[PDB]
Amino acid sequence: TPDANASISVSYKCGVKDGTKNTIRATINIKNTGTTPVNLSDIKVRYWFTSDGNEQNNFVCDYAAFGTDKVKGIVKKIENSVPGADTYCEISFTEDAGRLAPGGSTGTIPFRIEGAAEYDQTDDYSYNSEMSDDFGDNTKITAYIKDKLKYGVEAAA
Amino acid sequence: TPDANASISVSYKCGVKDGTKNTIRATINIKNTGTTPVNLSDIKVRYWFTSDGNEQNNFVCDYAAFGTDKVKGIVKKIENSVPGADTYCEISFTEDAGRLAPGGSTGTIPFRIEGAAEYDQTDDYSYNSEMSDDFGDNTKITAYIKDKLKYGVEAAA
Numbered sequence: 213t214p215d216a217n218a219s220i221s222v223s224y225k226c227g228v229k230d231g232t233k234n235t236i237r238a239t240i241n242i243k244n245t246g247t248t249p250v251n252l253s254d255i256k257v258r259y260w261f262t263s264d265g266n267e268q269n270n271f272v273c274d275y276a277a278f279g280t281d282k283v284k285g286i287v288k289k290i291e292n293s294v295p296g297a298d299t300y301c302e303i304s305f306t307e308d309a310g311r312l313a314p315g316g317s318t319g320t321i322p323f324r325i326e327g328a329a330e331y332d333q334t335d336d337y338s339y340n341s342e343m344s345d346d347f348g349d350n351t352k353i354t355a356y357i358k359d360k361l362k363y364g365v366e367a368a369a
Numbered sequence: 370t371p372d373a374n375a376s377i378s379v380s381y382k383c384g385v386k387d388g389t390k391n392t393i394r395a396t397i398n399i400k401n402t403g404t405t406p407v408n409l410s411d412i413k414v415r416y417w418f419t420s421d422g423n424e425q426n427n428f429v430c431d432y433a434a435f436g437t438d439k440v441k442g443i444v445k446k447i448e449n450s451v452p453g454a455d456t457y458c459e460i461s462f463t464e465d466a467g468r469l470a471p472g473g474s475t476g477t478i479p480f481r482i483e484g485a486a487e488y489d490q491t492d493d494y495s496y497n498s499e500m501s502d503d504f505g506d507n508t509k510i511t512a513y514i515k516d517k518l519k520y521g522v523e524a525a526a
């Protein structure tokens with residue numbers, strides 16, 4: 213089917229951490245790997261993690277070529293937690309965000325997930341410190357077109 | 370310098386030809402390979418060719434994610450022709466075309482160069498029929514940021 217044929221990939225770079233240790237930093241780059249355009253409004257990305265007691269976990273996008281105001285994020289609890297995830301951050305795009313041509317991509321989209329208390333990122337499904345120096349194929353980040361899985365493997369028991 | 374550090378690459382796919390043989394078809398995909406954004410308005414691309422007697426050679430862009438109305442082309446004669454080129458088509462972008470984030474790209478930008486009489490593309494510097502099945506690194510197409518060469522090798526005696 214036409215929807216079956218749409219394809220995207222995501223690349224990832226692990227950000228920096230300091231001393232307060234209450235900020236998850238990462239950058240993603242979403243590519244249209246198919247032969248027809250994709251609307252950004254149809255794309256969602258999930259970052260799976262353990263919130264380490266933080267009830268409040270706030271998403272911020274710090275840059276996007278098409279404007280930070282096009283990028284949305286919600287952080288939700290997982291009821292039946294799984295290895296590396298009791299929470300996920302779901303990144304999405306506004307209706308007016310634009311579209312990716314075949315072979316096109318967003319380029320860097322850096323974001324933060326902010327908590328009051330410290331995050332230990334080592335016990336997060338989507339965290340991969342091996343991808344700090346260069347963008348890599350972090351298949352523990354998932355992406356969706358019209359709510360159908362197109363990239364990565366979901367955290368799961 | 371900051372300008373020195375900006376970088377782009379271009380990938381290319383050779384289009385189709387038939388029977389009238391008076392249309393050059395190609396697709397390009399421009400990528401920001403640097404670590405700071407690039408404005409599309411600062412980018413130019415040149416396709417170098419022999420016009421085979423055609424005095425009139427018309428550029429058309431058939432698709433772009435950001436709109437065909439953002440893409441401009443002019444075809445100019447080369448006074449002191451060189452191997453594979455007595456003409457070039459210079460593709461550029463409007464002030465409002467948008468920008469490429471680091472790691473971003475345009476995706477497919479198909480275009481045509483239209484002539485009244487037949488083109489023989491085999492004697493064109495920028496033509497590479499080996500890149501018909503997949504996008505490739507056609508370094509006989511040049512690209513520029515603020516009129517400074519950033520990709521490819523210009524046709525030259």
Ligand SMILES: [Ca+2]
Pocket residue numbers: 261262263264331332333334335336
């Ligand atoms: Ca954690």
Ligand SMILES: [Ca+2]
Pocket residue numbers: 418419420421488489490491492493
């Ligand atoms: Ca020719």
